[PDB]
Amino acid sequence: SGIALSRLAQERKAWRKDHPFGFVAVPTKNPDGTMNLMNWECAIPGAAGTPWAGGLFKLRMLFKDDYPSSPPKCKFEPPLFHPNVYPSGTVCLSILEEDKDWRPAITIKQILLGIQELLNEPNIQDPAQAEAYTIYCQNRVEYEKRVRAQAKKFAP
Ligand SMILES: O=S1(=O)Nc2ccccc2-c2ccccc21
């Protein structure tokens, strides 16, 4: 898709020029070695001063041919413990749904900052996985203990 590839080239240019510290966002490669702008490997650092601090959380960003009509699918690999992350790793976030709060103008930087914000502030109205949601509601101290252990597990 010329439209998608043009925009994704723009996003790549913008990202490389200016991005939040500690974040990674890089296109992958096709089997013939050429750049695949439709599939990006990303990393989100835990925010300092939070239970997520010290962790670096890898995710994949997958674009459809009609991007930016549609949002990318954003998938933590491996899946994370968090009330709004499905067991598959897919992130549940309103800006990542075409029929909700997605806008074509939203940038890869805004997506990754939006997901970082989600990590530290779950949306209890949108549970995506039973376990983390249940613990978040029943015992916040236990919830943070689990989050800190996970952050240590994914320390770079
Ligand atoms: O090469 S990866 O360890 N491997 C990897 C696999 C899926 C998604 C992201 C990543 C990633 C992201 C940032 C830095 C490094 C990696």
Side-chain angles (χ1 to χ4, degrees):
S1 167
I3 294 173
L5 290 171
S6 300
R7 172 64 177 275
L8 286 159
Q10 173 184 283
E11 293 282 334
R12 183 178 178 267
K13 186 166 189 177
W15 176 264
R16 291 173 62 88
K17 162 166 293 190
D18 179 50
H19 61 263
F21 183 74
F23 287 71
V24 178
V26 182
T28 57
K29 291 183 180 181
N30 292 307
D32 62 5
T34 55
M35 175 175 288
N36 182 6
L37 285 167
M38 308 305 287
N39 181 337
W40 292 48
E41 282 162 354
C42 304
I44 298 172
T50 79
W52 301 79
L56 185 62
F57 307 100
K58 308 189 177 194
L59 77 147
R60 192 174 299 279
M61 202 171 284
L62 299 171
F63 298 88
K64 309 205 310 171
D65 285 336
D66 65 354
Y67 170 82
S69 186
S70 56
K73 170 183 190 181
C74 298
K75 189 165 175 173
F76 282 111
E77 296 181 352
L80 298 179
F81 174 93
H82 186 281
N84 306 112
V85 175
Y86 291 104
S88 68
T90 301
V91 176
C92 181
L93 183 59
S94 288
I95 61 165
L96 297 178
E97 298 184 52
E98 191 180 300
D99 292 324
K100 292 187 182 177
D101 287 347
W102 172 251
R103 293 176 282 106
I106 294 180
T107 63
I108 288 175
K109 175 199 296 180
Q110 287 174 327
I111 294 171
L112 291 176
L113 288 165
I115 297 173
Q116 189 194 40
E117 173 196 12
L118 177 65
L119 289 178
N120 193 41
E121 183 60 11
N123 185 348
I124 61 175
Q125 295 174 349
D126 290 330
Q129 63 159 266
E131 201 206 2
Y133 177 79
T134 296
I135 300 177
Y136 187 77
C137 292
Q138 290 179 351
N139 192 333
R140 196 66 46 84
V141 170
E142 177 68 11
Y143 176 78
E144 298 203 341
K145 174 174 159 183
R146 293 282 299 273
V147 171
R148 293 193 316 269
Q150 176 169 253
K152 184 178 174 54
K153 178 178 183 170
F154 296 116

